[PDB]
């Protein structure tokens, strides 16, 4: 019943807010820990023989991640007797805190759980998993940007983009594709993190807005497998005719908003020299674009054959409108001549 | 001296050698029993007695019992002993050689009493957490 | 750092490698995870006993709680997977 569901989801919100507030480490590990328990059940609504093992995957990886994290905290304490976030004082510990967080974001090569888990749940729980869960671990990485061992960070940051690419060309059903999209953008967030966190948080905001746009659209059409999406051009042409655009904003074609992340990132890293890395990165982001395009071909640009049975469905308007949606489209697209406002994030 | 705390650490580690190898959960439950009592002993040696008895009570007197329930739900005929497979036993030996290579190489009272008066925040989040954990168990099993 | 701590840390490393070698029915993994939990606990408590950093005497037990708590959750999922098969990771 909704009265319990809402308490769970609110305690997830709390279970992340807690990470964003507390300075003491123990309250952060508590933040993730409470977040987990409240995250699993919401994946289990409706409940499927499939969904169950989805949640098994998610829990199993999040649990081992949280374990390594707490271990590395304890080692940090052993070699500096502190609990405040700040710098860590022992590289053998620090790399593990980086690993634990690397699982929590789902960055490659730790990534393999994310495409699978997404498959196992409905687009509601899916969207929430790909947005809200991406806050907390980043919320702590921004706080430990000061001492990060950049080599280790850029390697996962790149490899997340290659794997976020190649594994994206291959799939049909959309949810797995959304998984590889996100797994690819996280490479771009976590890449620039050692150099300048404000660019990260900018990119984060764009990513969340974007994936809200998509998942609200998939909800609006209840499409899933690519073919299932293909029929929608005749029933409610607008929304396919809008998936095209939001997809291009994923692709970062430059007038569109989604270009704003990359094009600030390239700036920042370029101040650092490091000129080669963004070139490889930006080149691969293309590869990321391509399956957004193919998916666009299944949908709006071209009309796959309709099934007959569709006709009766034409009489019936969609209902239960999702208020927040139109703004999530528009912000995730047209906002490009409002980059400078990014400095609001200081 | 006796090095008794240290040799306890050694029995602890082999407790995880036979435990981390994976030969039917029940025997692993034995592994955590042995490692459990060894654990409480080791922490007892520094005199944080209340804690060692927490783990000797709350953990081993709680957990491994409920695992003594999961196996009733899992089991499968002919569970394997440590000796019952080449990879399992191979693993156990694999732990032994390593750890052997390593060998070849009150304040508490008020300290925890402080939890209530002087640390209400943790009490709040633990209360809330355990509560909604019960709720989660509901919303899975139901 | 005194050798004992090194020994417990190593018990952690085994308590992880055991989780990841990961085989057959997964109930073993919930065990190995709990063992991992216990090693972190002990390694914490020895420290708080060491420096008489008294407030932190509260943490290990609190640590224990949530950690045990998630494991308490974990069995439930296993039930469900056990419910349709008679469990195996395979």
């Amino acid at each position: 019943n909704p009265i319990i569901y809402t308490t769970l989801i609110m305690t997830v919100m709390s279970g992340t807010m807690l990470v964003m507030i507390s300075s003491h480490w123990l309250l952060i590990w508590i933040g993730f820990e409470m977040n987990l328990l409240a995250m699993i059940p919401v994946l289990m609504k409706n409940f499927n023989p499939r969904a169950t093992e989805a949640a098994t995957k998610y829990f199993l990886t999040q649990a081992t991640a949280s374990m390594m994290l707490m271990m590395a905290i304890i080692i940090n304490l052993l070699y500096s007797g502190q609990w405040t976030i700040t710098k860590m004082f022992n590289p053998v510990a620090m790399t593990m805190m980086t690993m634990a967080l690397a699982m929590k974001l789902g960055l490659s090569p730790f990534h393999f759980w994310v495409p699978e888990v997404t498959q196992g749940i409905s687009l509601q729980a899916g969207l929430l998993l790909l947005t809200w869960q991406k806050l907390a671990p980043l919320s702590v990485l921004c706080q430990i940007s000061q001492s990060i061992n950049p080599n280790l960070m850029l390697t996962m940051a790149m490899l997340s983009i290659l794997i976020g690419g190649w594994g994206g060309l291959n799939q049909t059903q959309l949810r797995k594709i959304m998984a590889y999209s996100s797994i690819a953008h996280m490479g771009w967030m976590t890449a620039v993190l050692p150099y300048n966190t404000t660019m990260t948080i900018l990119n984060l905001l764009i990513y969340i807005t974007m994936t809200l746009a998509m998942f609200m659209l998939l909800i609006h059409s209840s499409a899933t497998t690519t073919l299932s999406l293909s029929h929608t051009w005749n029933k409610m042409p607008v929304i396919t005719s809008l998936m095209m655009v939001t997809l291009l904003s994923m692709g970062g074609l430059p007038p569109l908003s989604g270009f704003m992340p990359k094009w600030m990132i390239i700036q920042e890293m370029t101040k650092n020299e490091s000129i080669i890395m963004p070139t490889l990165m930006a080149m691969t982001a293309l590869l990321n674009l391509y399956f957004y395009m193919r998916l666009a071909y299944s949908s709006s640009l071209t009309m796959f054959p309709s099934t007959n049975n569709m006709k009766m469905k034409w009489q019936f308007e969609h209902t239960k409108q999702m208020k927040l949606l139109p703004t999530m489209i528009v912000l995730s697209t047209l906002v490009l001549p409002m980059t400078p406002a990014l400095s609001s994030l200081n | 001296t006796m090095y008794i705390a240290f040799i306890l650490s050694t029995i602890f580690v082999i407790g995880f050698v036979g435990f981390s190898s994976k030969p039917s959960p029940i025997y692993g439950g034995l592994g955590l029993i042995v490692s459990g009592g060894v654990g409480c002993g080791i922490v007892l040696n520094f005199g944080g007695s209340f804690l060692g008895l927490m783990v000797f009570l709350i953990y081993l007197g709680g957990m491994l019992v409920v695992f003594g329930y999961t196996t009733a739900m899992a089991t499968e005929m002919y569970p394997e002993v440590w000796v019952s497979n080449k990879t399992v036993f191979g693993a156990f030996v694999s732990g032994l050689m390593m750890e052997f290579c390593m060998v070849y190489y009150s304040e508490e009272a008020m300290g925890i009493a402080a939890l209530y008066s002087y640390g209400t925040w943790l009490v709040i989040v633990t209360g809330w957490s355990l509560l909604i954990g019960v709720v989660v168990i509901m919303e899975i099993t139901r | 750092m005194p050798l004992v701590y090194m020994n417990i840390i190593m018990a952690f490393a085994i308590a992880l490698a055991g989780l990841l070698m990961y085989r057959s029915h997964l109930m073993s993994s919930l065990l190995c995870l709990e063992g991992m939990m216990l090693s972190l606990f002990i390694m914490s408590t020895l420290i708080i006993l060491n420096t008489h950093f008294t407030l932190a005497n509260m943490m290990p037990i609190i640590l224990l709680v949530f950690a045990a708590c998630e494991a308490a959750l974990g069995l439930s999922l296993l039930v469900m997977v056990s419910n349709t098969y008679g469990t195996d990771y395979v």
């Binding site: 053998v92 | 001296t1 090095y3 705390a5 040696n45 | 750092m1 005194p2 050798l3 004992v4 090194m6």
Partner: peptide
């Protein structure tokens, strides 16, 4: 100990 990071050795009592 050379592994991972140094283990200072000797008996436990010393600390």
């Amino acid at each position: 100990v050379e592994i991972i990071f140094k283990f200072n050795g000797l008996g436990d009592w010393v600390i």
